[PDB]
Amino acid sequence: HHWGYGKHNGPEHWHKDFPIAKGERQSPVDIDTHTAKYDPSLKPLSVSYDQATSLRILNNGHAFNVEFDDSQDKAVLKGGPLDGTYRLIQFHFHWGSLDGQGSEHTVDKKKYAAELHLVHWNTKYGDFGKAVQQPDGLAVLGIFLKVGSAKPGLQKVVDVLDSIKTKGKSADFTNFDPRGLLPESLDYWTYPGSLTTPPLLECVTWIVLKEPISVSSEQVLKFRKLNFNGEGEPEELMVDNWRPAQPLKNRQIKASFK
Ligand SMILES: O=C(O)c1cccc(Oc2ccccc2)c1
Ligand SMILES: [Zn+2]
């Protein structure tokens, strides 16, 4: 498969190899704040990242992933809309070429500069590959980034990007604390959806925080110096690696807050 974000291999093309691209629960979506309803039934959200064990950071030619040890319940997401326990496996971002675009989810059609995806899998299914075959297999915590003040807890990420410039490069990335990427409030919207990259599987409970984090222009500029290409190939800057909003179809977005 040779998908990407360009004219010739971008999101409009994905449905030919991945027909679920035109499915009934695709992500991202626009979150219309005047149609999402507060749901008093939602339990409190629980982000338990104290024992998180980061391992490595990888440029996969589409984004970069920070990878965690998920062989036990070290960093887990529970509560909110979720039943049971979801283990953190990795995070990554989507970002733009300019500060006015980059997020995947939008808020009243507003695009943020970037969006962070913290990807977790349901432990009742034993492993990630089994979990993605289930409608409740994953929970992705989505966090918007806006440009303003620097985010200190991001800086160790931006500083390692020089070492994974091109597709296929990885670097050791131990002792990174994903708590430093969270906003103050855990107020969220939730809806059922999908992976936003091929294979676009419809296995995700999305939990999108209302409060963005601020990052500096210098920080996001360094994201934009990555490369989609491999070493010794012509340079294609890793920018605009976001899928646009997909049809909501027969889905309701619920708010955790009034
Ligand atoms: O779009 C994402 O957030 C995402 C996150 C993790 C993995 C992933 O892609 C695969 C999932 C299962 C099998 C092969 C690839 C996509
Ligand atoms: Zn993502």
Swiss-Prot record:
Chief location: cytoplasm
A Gene Ontology biological process term: morphogenesis of an epithelium
Residues annotated as site: Involved in the binding of some activators, including histamine and L-histidine: 90
Impact noted for substituting residue 117 to E: Strongly reduced activity
Annotated consequence of substituting residue 60 to V: Reduced activity
Family: Belongs to the alpha-carbonic anhydrase family.
Organism this protein belongs to: Homo sapiens
PANTHER family: CARBONIC ANHYDRASE, CARBONIC ANHYDRASE 2
UniProt lineage: Eukaryota, Metazoa, Chordata, Craniata, Vertebrata
Effect upon mutating residue 197 to H: Higher affinity for bicarbonate. Enhanced proton transfer capacity
Listed result of changing residue 16 to E: In Jogjakarta
Name by which UniProt lists this protein: Carbonic anhydrase 2
Result after altering residue 63 to F: Reduced activity
Sections of the chain in a coiled coil: none
Annotated active site: 62 (proton donor/acceptor)
pH dependency: Optimum pH is 6-8.
Pfam families: Carb_anhydrase (PF00194)
Effect seen on changing residue 119 to K/R: Strongly reduced CO(2) hydrase and p-nitrophenyl acetate esterase activities
Binding note for cofactor: Zinc. Can also use cobalt(II) with lower efficiency, but not copper(II), nickel(II) and manganese(II).
Effect upon mutating residue 65 to L: Reduced activity
Annotated consequence of substituting residue 140 to G: Weakly impaired activity
Reaction it catalyzes: hydrogencarbonate + H(+) = CO2 + H2O; urea = cyanamide + H2O
